[PDB]
Paper text:
Compounds 3 and 4 had DR50 values >450-fold and >2,000-fold better, respectively. Compounds 2, 3, and 4 showed the greatest fold-stabilization in the protein titrations decreasing 14-3-3σ/FOXO1 KD values 5-fold, 4-fold, and 12-fold. Compound 3 was also cocrystallized with FOXO1, showing a highly similar binding mode, but a lack of the hydrogen bonding with S45 of 14-3-3σ. Interestingly, the unique 21 FOXO1-stabilizers had a highly conserved scaffold, with the phenyl ring engaging FOXO1 often decorated with halogens or a triazole moiety. Thus, while the compound 2/3 scaffold emphasized the chemical moieties necessary for stabilizing FOXO1, crystal structures also expose a lack of flexibility of the FOXO1 peptide.
14-3-3 is ubiquitously expressed in mammals and plays multiple roles within the cell, including phosphorylation protection, conformational changes, subcellular trafficking, and induction or disruption of other PPIs.13,27−29 14-3-3 typically binds to a phosphorylated serine/threonine in intrinsically disordered regions of its clients. We explored the scope of disulfide tethering for the discovery of selective PPI stabilizers (molecular glues) using the hub protein 14-3-3σ.
Author numbering:
A (entry chain B), B (entry chain B): 21 to 28
C (entry chain A), D (entry chain A): -4 to 231
Amino acid sequence: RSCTWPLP
Amino acid sequence: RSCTWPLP
Amino acid sequence: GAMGSMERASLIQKAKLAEQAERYEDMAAFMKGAVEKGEELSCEERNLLSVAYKNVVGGQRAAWRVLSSIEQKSNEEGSEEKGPEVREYREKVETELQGVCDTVLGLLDSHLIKEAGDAESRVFYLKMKGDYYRYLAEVATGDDKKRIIDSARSAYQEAMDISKKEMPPTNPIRLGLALNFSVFHYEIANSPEEAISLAKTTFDEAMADLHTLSEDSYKDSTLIMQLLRDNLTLWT
Amino acid sequence: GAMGSMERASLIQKAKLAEQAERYEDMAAFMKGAVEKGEELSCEERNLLSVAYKNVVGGQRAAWRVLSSIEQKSNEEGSEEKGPEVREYREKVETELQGVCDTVLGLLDSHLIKEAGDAESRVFYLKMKGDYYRYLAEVATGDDKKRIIDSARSAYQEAMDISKKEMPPTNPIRLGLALNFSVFHYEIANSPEEAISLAKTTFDEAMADLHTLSEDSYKDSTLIMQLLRDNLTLWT
Ligand SMILES: *SCCNC(=O)[C@H]1CCCN(C(=O)c2cc(Cl)cc(Cl)c2N)C1
Ligand SMILES: *SCCNC(=O)[C@H]1CCCN(C(=O)c2cc(Cl)cc(Cl)c2N)C1
Ligand SMILES: [Mg+2]
Ligand SMILES: [Mg+2]
Ligand SMILES: [Mg+2]
Ligand SMILES: [Mg+2]
């Protein structure tokens, strides 16, 4: 998928 | 650790 | 709520313990309790809040995607009728996800955003507002999908406008905001060109400002820049 | 309970969906609901029950170990006093773990074990009873620790006696029982020699019976045999 920030 | 079965 | 009797400092201490234990539901509950004390959050405390809810909603989103995929396959031609269970269970997970999003949005509206005067804090919270409307948008299908999408867009835009005025182009909050708004454009707004433009401009302006940074700040910024590059690679 | 209105078949269907979604709390709740319908469980359904609770308790046990480690360090000499929070939060996780164990034990006592006449089912449930008393033993410190340990031992022993009479030495349930009883001996009963003897005898008797098996049964049995070998390697 596309990367989004904080990251779980 | 020591292995036990089902494995989570 | 159920955290009303616990000291603010104890709630923050326990959130950190819950993180170490990978108990993110507990971590979120502790941080909600801390926010509800009514004091502003420090930088570290904002990060704890974000990590807690990101992990909780991240689990729900992953589960929702699994279930939606199964549901979509069930509604193909030649797929055997399996009754209402898949839809019911997808709906259950969806409703729980929406609840978490509404909880976060509630904390932001009552009253984190209005009390946030410094750029760092205000941009952080507006980015969160964008992000949780974006998660609501991912599962939205009804009369309100457009309004949910616009709510995300509006929050991200306000955050962007402040960040460009008040923060350097390498600021990690500014970078993460831009990264997530670019994903909003690509995945939610059906605007891949806007997504690509935003990611590229953000990357290039950050690159040009790296020379001003310490080694530690350079590490923080370049980590997020790599995520922008990763998306651009995926998208082009 | 809250699953009282849902069809047995729907509960099993949803447990499988929850597994695919990695939603183990939901999976456990669905399987509890299915058990509470009062019908015996099939082989596949017993496995769903076991997988669900193993994942839930596995998370709790991992968290408990993190927290207990932190608590133990806090009570060393030269460690700064940090107040009651670590103990409180360890206690919270502990109580939740104990609750899950009591729930599983409750299902076994009301009325899975008494209705289980075939060796496969009866050994499966008695192994579970041993396992959940063993998890209670891992966190026990009071007047009842010895009795908890004996409850585990008694369940495992009954299971062992039936398995040796009624199942071949390669049977995966027999193997997994022996593996777990060997761990009980090593970790809980302070009997490493018994643990080692049990693992060795079980491995050797299984080895000698592999020739009787199909390719698929051979795979099932040898997987568990490797776990016995892994423990023996760790212990000797
Ligand atoms: S809070 C005091 C120490 N750290 C910081 O101020 C920042 C520097 C380290 C990098 N940061 C982030 O990358 C970040 C960005 C976003 Cl958009 C959200 C989060 Cl939760 C973080 N941690 C924080
Ligand atoms: S249920 C019908 C198909 N499978 C089986 O009967 C067994 C064969 C596959 C191996 N099995 C196990 O290893 C096993 C052992 C124990 Cl002690 C617990 C569990 Cl949950 C399993 N799955 C099941
Ligand atoms: Mg819905
Ligand atoms: Mg622009
Ligand atoms: Mg206790
Ligand atoms: Mg013996």
